[PDB]
Design a protein around this ligand. Structure first.
Ligand SMILES: CC(C)=CCC/C(C)=C/CC/C(C)=C/CC/C(C)=C(\F)COP(=O)(O)OP(=O)(O)O
Ligand SMILES: [Mg+2]
Ligand SMILES: [Mg+2]
Length: 291
């Protein structure tokens, strides 16, 4: 249920995509399979389509980082109480800042954030965005617990950093190090232009993730933190889940158009960085449309 979404942005693939898979298989089986008790190795094909003009020598590190990230976020999203989610997010941020850990769950996260090849300002950007991702996870869980009714607008604002689109855009500088300088410059000199690209990105990918969820074990629901159910409540006329899905699909396309328009203005500043952003969006949607 919920339809495939056709991104405006091509799903492009690194030429060593095969090596990316297998590195992921072999790395997972050695470093995550023991503790994880999985769709985790699949982040090989994914990194290869997120960073298709990236430097292959950075992709194995990025794969490990992203497998660890996905693993821990599954911890976070599955937690039912603020006390446990707070412990996990604080430990994530400690590790992201290079605090040593002997918790194997965090071993690959530490490898990635302490990679000596990071551009130093790029690394600071990535840590700060991971904090924003974590702050949104914490806020969304408070919402579902308190069963608080918010608007779609309020939700999407909270949700944007928690889609990790912005984090993946920051690691463009790691995976495609010829873009580190341009990444730093846009944040220092053109922050508002940057946010005009990042904000419709997070909104569209947020809507897409929420659309692709619904039901499995017995009742995920998430009635207060899934944009489809949020709109059901906010609509000024009664709408069922089906009609609600249709509307948010239309909103996906509207937010992607708004992102496209922004990327035209980013490309005059940096053609390379604009194209790398397209490919992160295009590969994310491409990879997601295995539904
Ligand atoms: C990157 C995205 C958004 C999707 C697919 C590509 C991928 C596996 C990237 C790994 C990079 C990172 C940091 C991912 C971790 C955070 C994100 C967002 C996810 F886990 C999305 O997976 P989900 O649908 O279970 O959860 P939710 O976001 O709806 O709660
Ligand atoms: Mg999440
Ligand atoms: Mg999740």
């Amino acid at each position: 249920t919920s339809p495939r979404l056709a991104s405006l942005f091509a799903c492009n693939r690194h030429e060593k995509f095969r090596e990316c898979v297998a590195y992921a298989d072999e790395s997972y089986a050695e470093s995550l399979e023991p503790v994880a008790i999985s769709r985790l190795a699949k982040l090989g094909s994914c990194t290869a389509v997120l960073y298709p003009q990236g430097d292959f020598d950075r992709l194995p590190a990025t794969i490990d980082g992203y497998m660890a990230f996905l693993f821990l976020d599954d911890l976070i999203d599955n937690s039912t109480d603020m006390s446990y989610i707070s412990e996990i997010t604080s430990r994530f941020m400690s590790t992201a800042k290079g605090t040593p850990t002997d918790d194997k769950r965090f071993f690959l996260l530490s490898r990635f954030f302490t990679d000596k090849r990071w551009d130093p300002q790029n690394l600071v950007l990535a840590i700060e965005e991971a904090q924003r991702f974590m702050d949104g996870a914490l806020a969304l869980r408070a919402i579902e617990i308190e069963e608080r009714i918010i608007t779609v607008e309020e939700y999407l604002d909270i949700r944007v950093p928690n889609t990790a689109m912005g984090f993946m855009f920051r690691v463009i500088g790691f995976a495609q190090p010829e873009l580190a300088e341009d990444l730093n410059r846009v944040m220092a000199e053109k922050p508002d232009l940057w946010d005009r690209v990042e904000s419709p990105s997070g909104k569209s990918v947020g809507i897409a993730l929420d659309l692709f969820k619904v039901n499995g074990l017995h009742a995920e629901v998430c009635s207060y933190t899934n944009v489809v159910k949020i709109w059901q409540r906010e609509s000024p006329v009664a709408i069922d889940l089906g009609e609600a899905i249709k509307f948010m699909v239309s909103e996906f396309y509207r937010y992607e158009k708004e992102m496209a328009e922004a990327l035209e203005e980013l490309a005059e500043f940096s053609p390379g960085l604009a194209q790398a952003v397209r490919d992160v969006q295009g590969g994310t949607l491409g990879w997601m449309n295995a539904e």
